[model samples]
Target: GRLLSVLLAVNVLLLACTLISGGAFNKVAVYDTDVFALLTTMMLLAALWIVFYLLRTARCHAGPIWLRGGLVLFGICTLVMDVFKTGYYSSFFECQSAIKILHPIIQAVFVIVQTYFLWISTHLDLTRCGLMFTLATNLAIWMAAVVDESVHQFQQGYFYLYPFNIEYSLFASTMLYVMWKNVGRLRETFFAGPVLGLLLFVVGLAVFILYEVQGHTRQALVIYYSFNIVCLGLMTLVSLSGSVIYRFDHKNPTRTLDVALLWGAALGQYAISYYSIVAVVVGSPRDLQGALNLSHALLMIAQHTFQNVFIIESLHRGCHWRRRCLKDISLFLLLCNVILWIMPAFGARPHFSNTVEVDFYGYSLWAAIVNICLPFGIFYRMHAVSSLLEVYVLS
Candidate 1:
C-alpha cells in the first residue's frame, strides 16, 4: 500500500537514531530514560501490530499464520532476565527514573506477546510496513541489547545470561525480517545424526569453556587457536571441495533468502576480517598469540569466501542425492557452524580482546567495532548452520 523505499528510509533513519543514541549513552554517564521511553513506545507499537495481525488472522482475511525449538527457550530466558533486571533497576530506584522499572516490565510483556505470536504465525497474509515495523523494532531492541551488553562488559553488569538475551532478540530479528520479505513471495528442514561432527561439536564446547575460564593464559590462548585453525582448516577444504565438486556434477538452483542472508552475513564477517587483517599488517605481531591470530584471520577469510561460494552454489544444485540419508560434508559443516556460533554468540571475546587488534584499533574504537559487527558475524555462522541443514535435507 506504500512505497517500500519510503518505509526503508524511515527505518534506516530510525535505526541510526536509536543506535546513535545508544552509542552515545555508552560513552558518558548520561541517563537513558529517554532511550528507554523511546524503545518502550517502539516495542509497544510492535506488540500492538503483532496482536492486531494475530487476532486478525484465524478471524480476518482467510487462514492463520507462525518457535517450538531454541527460540522459545531463549524467550523464556529473556523473561527471567527481565525479571532480574527489574530487581536491579528497582534496587537503584532511589536515584533511578521510573522508566527503569517500566522498561523491563514492558520488555517482559513484549517478549511474551511477540514470541508466542511470531512462533504460531509464520504465514503473513498482510503488510510490508508491519513486518518492517516488527523487524526494525526487534533490531532496535537488538541494538539496545548490544549497547547495554558492551556497557556491561566495560564495567560489567548482571551477566552470565545477558549473552543469552543477546542471541534471543537477534534470532527473532532475522525471523521477522524473513517473514516481512515473504509477504508477497513463494516459499522455502533437517537431520543432525552425524557422529564425527557431533564429536567435534562437543570437544569444541569443552575447549571454548576452557578458553573463557583461562582467557589470559598463554596455554589457553594457544590451545584455542590451535584447535580453531585445525577446525577452520578442515571446513575450508570441505567447502572448497564442495564448490568445485558442483562444477563437475551437473544438477540444478535461486536468488533465495538463504543466499541473500548468506551474502549479507558474509559481508559482516568480512568487516572483522578486513579490519583485523589490516591491524596485523600495520602493527605486526611479536608473540606466538599474534602469529596464530594472524593466520586464523586469513583462514577465516579464505574459509568463508570459499564456504559462501560452496553454500551459494550447493544450494542452487538440483537435489539428486549422492547419499541416501545424510551428506557427509554438509552435516560436518553444520556441526562446525554450531561451534563457531556458540563462541561469538554467547560472549567469546578473542576478537574483542585479542592483543593485536585491541592495541592496533585502541580499546574504545575496537570494542565498538566488535559490538557493532560481531553479532552479524555470529549470525553468519548461525545462518550457515541452517543453510547447510537445508542443503543436507534436500540431499
Candidate 2:
C-alpha cells in the first residue's frame, strides 16, 4: 500500500512538473499536443497492464447494482464514440494533428480501465496497489481530456462533436456521484431532509441559469461573486464542522501517501489562489467590476483553503457524518469544479478581463498552470470524498 501510494504521488508530481516545464519552455504554443501525446502513451500502457492482469485472474464481478449499470451505460457510450472516431479518422486519414487521431483511441482505453476499476472496487478485498494505480490512471485520463478539450476549443473554436466529450465527462461524473452516494448510505445521520436538499440544489441551478442568461453583465458578475461566496462559505463551514465532530479510528490509520498527495495537490491550488488574490488586492480599483474581482479572488482563496483543509482533516479520521449533507455538498462542489473546468476548456476567457491578473503572470503561463493544476486539485477532492466513503464503509 505504501509503495502504491508513493507511486501515485510520483505520477502526479511528474505530470505537474512536466506540464509546467513544457509551458515555460514553449509559452507561444498550447501544450496540449505534447501533453496529450504523453498521456495517450501512459494510458495505453496502463490499460494494457490492467488487461493482462484481468486476463490472467478473470476477476470480473459486479459490485453495486447502480455502479454496475453505470459502467455498462458508460462503456456503451464510449464504444459508440470509438466507432464514430474510427469511421471519421479513417476517412480523414490525412489529418495532421496526431493528438486528434490518437485522442479517441486513448479515450476508449480509459473507459475500459474505468469500468474495470469500478467493478473491482465493489469488492472490498482488492489490493491497495490495484486501487492506487487505477485511481491514478483515471485521474490522469481526466486531466488529459480537460487539457485537450481546452486547447482544441481555444485553437479551433468549438468542434461540432465536442458535446460528446462533455457528455462523456457527465457520465463519468454521475458514476462518481453514485459511488459516493453508495458509500454515504452506509453511514448514519441526516444532515438535511431529502426534499429540502433537493430544493436547495434546484435553487442553485436556477441561480446558475440566471447568470448564464445575463451573460457578462455587471449584475451577472455580482451574482456570480455573491453566489460563490455563500456556497463556498457554507461548504467550508460544513466540512470543518464534520472534521471537528468525527473521531478517528485508530484501527484504520491514515496512510502517509494519502496525506502527502492531498497536501501536495492542495498547495498547488493555494499557490494559484494566492497569486490571484494579490493581483486583485494590489491593482487599482477602476470600477465596481474591479471590486467584485477582488471579492471573487478573496473568496476563491478562502474556498480553496477551507475545502482542502476540511477534506484533509476528514480523511485523516474514520468517523462518518450525516449522509445527506455531505452527499449534497460533495456533489455540488464536484459540479462546480466541472463547470469551472468546462468553461475554460470551451474557450471562455474570464481571466482576460482582469488586467492585473494578466500582468502578474503572463497569460499563457498562468493559463497553463491553471489548466494543469486545477484539474488535479479537483480530482484530488473528488478522490478524497470517494475514499472517505470507502473508509466509512470499512470502518
Candidate 3:
C-alpha cells in the first residue's frame, strides 16, 4: 500500500511539474519536445510499477473484478501513449512531426477510451456508447490539425458540422443523469466519490465549452485546466489513502475507515476523469491569454491546497479511524453538497450575451440536484456498501 501511495504521489507531482514547467499553462514552447519526451518516459515507468503491485496482491474473489481489470488496462494504455508520444525510443523522435499532427486526436482518443473503460468498470452502462461519440469527435479534430499542419498556415475552420456546445452538452446531460440513477445500486464505497467527482468535473467542462465558443479566454483557463488540476490532486490523495486503508484493514471487513476511504477513492477517480476528458477534447492552450491564464493558475493551485488541507485530511482521518458507517455517509453527502455550491462559481461561470448566463444557471441547478439530492436519496442503500467495506477490512 505504501509503495502504491508513493508511486501515485510521484506520478501526480511529475505530471503537474511537467505541465507547469513545460509552459502548457502559458501556451509557450518553453520545454521543447525533448523535455516532454523524458517526462512521458518517467510516467510510463511509474505506471508500470504500480501495475505490478496491483497484480501481485489481487485475489480471485477478494474484490471487484472490474476494478482490477480497469487499473491494469489504464496502466498499459498510459505506457503505450507515453512511449509513442513522449519519444521514449529513438525511432519515436524521428517521427515526432508526424505524431504532432495526430497528438490531439491521439490524446483525445486516449482520454475518451480510458474514461469509457473507467465508466464501465464503475458499472455506468448508459455512457457505454459515449465511447463512440468521443472517438468521432476526436477524429474530426485530428483531421483539422493535420490539414493545418500540412498547409503551413493557421486554419480557422472546424471539420465537424455539429457545434461542440450542443454535442458536449447533450453528452454531459445524458451521462450525468444516467450515472445519477444507476450508480446508487452499486456498492456505495465503489461509486459515490466517482459519481460526484465526474459530475462536477463535467460542469467545469461545460463552462470551458461556453467560453471557448465565445472567445472568453480568461474564463476558459479557469474552467478548463485549473479546475482539472485541483480535482486530480484531490483524487490522488483520496485514492492513496484508500489503498492504504485497504492494505492495512483488509482482514477486518467491518472497519469504518475502509468504508470512508472507498467512498473517497470512487469520488476521486470520477473527478480525475471528468477534468482530463474535457481538457483533451478542447485541444491545447491555443487561445489562452495572460490575465486569464494567471487567474486560472491561481485558482488551480489554490484549490489543490484547499483540498489537501480540508477535504483530504478530513476524509483521511475518517477512513483511518474507521468512523461509524452512518456517520461516514452523512459526512460524505454533506461535503459533496458543500462542494456543489462552488460548481456555479462566479469566475468560472460562462456567459454569452446574457443567454449564456441563463443556460449556465440551468446547468448549476441540475448539478446541485444530482450532487446533493441524489446522494441523500440513496444513503439508505449505501448501508450495504458500508457493510461490504467493513467485511473487506476484516477479511
Which candidate wins on TM-score?
A: 1
lDDT of 3 by residue, 1-395 (tens): 22343344345445444543444323544443543343334324333332432354255112323333333343344334434443433334464554343443344344443344334422223222222232233223222222222222111232222112221222322332333334326332445554665565566556545553333454554555555455544544543454454355524244453344335333432343233234433442434333333334344333333333333333343453443432333333333323433332112222232222123334433232223222221221232234334333432
The local distance difference test score of each candidate is 0.69, 0.53, 0.36
Residue-wise C-alpha lDDT for candidate 2, range 1-395, written one tens digit per residue: 34554476468646754673565356586556666566666667556656765675576511223335534654666666665765566566675576767877777877777676556654322343444444455555555544443443232322333323433443354454344334414333253533333544565566555543222556656666666556556556655655555443267776665566556656655666677777766664566766766766666567666656655655555423454445544444444443433323233332434455666665655655555544345444444445545444433
lDDT of 3 at 243: 40
Summed over model 2, clashes come to 0
RMSD (Å) of each candidate, 1 decimal: 5.4, 8.7, 17.3
C-alpha positional error of residue 297 in candidate 1 after TM-score superposition, expressed in Å: 0.7
What tens digits encode model 1's per-residue C-alpha lDDT throughout 1-395? 43673376376548646554655565566556677887788888788888787777866411111123456767887888788878777766688788878888988988898888767754433466777777777777666656654544321264445535566777677667655655666401123336667877887889877665323767777877887788889888878766766666533336465677777777766788788888887785666766788888888888888888878777776453445333777888888888877666665543423778878867666766676777676667867887787788786
Model 1, stretches more than 4 Å misplaced? 4-29, 61-70, 122-128, 149-158, 163-166, 184-196, 213-215, 248-255, 319-326, 349-353
For candidate 3, the lDDT comes to 0.36
Name the lDDT value of residue 393 in candidate 2: 48
Of 1 and 2, the candidate ahead on lDDT is 1
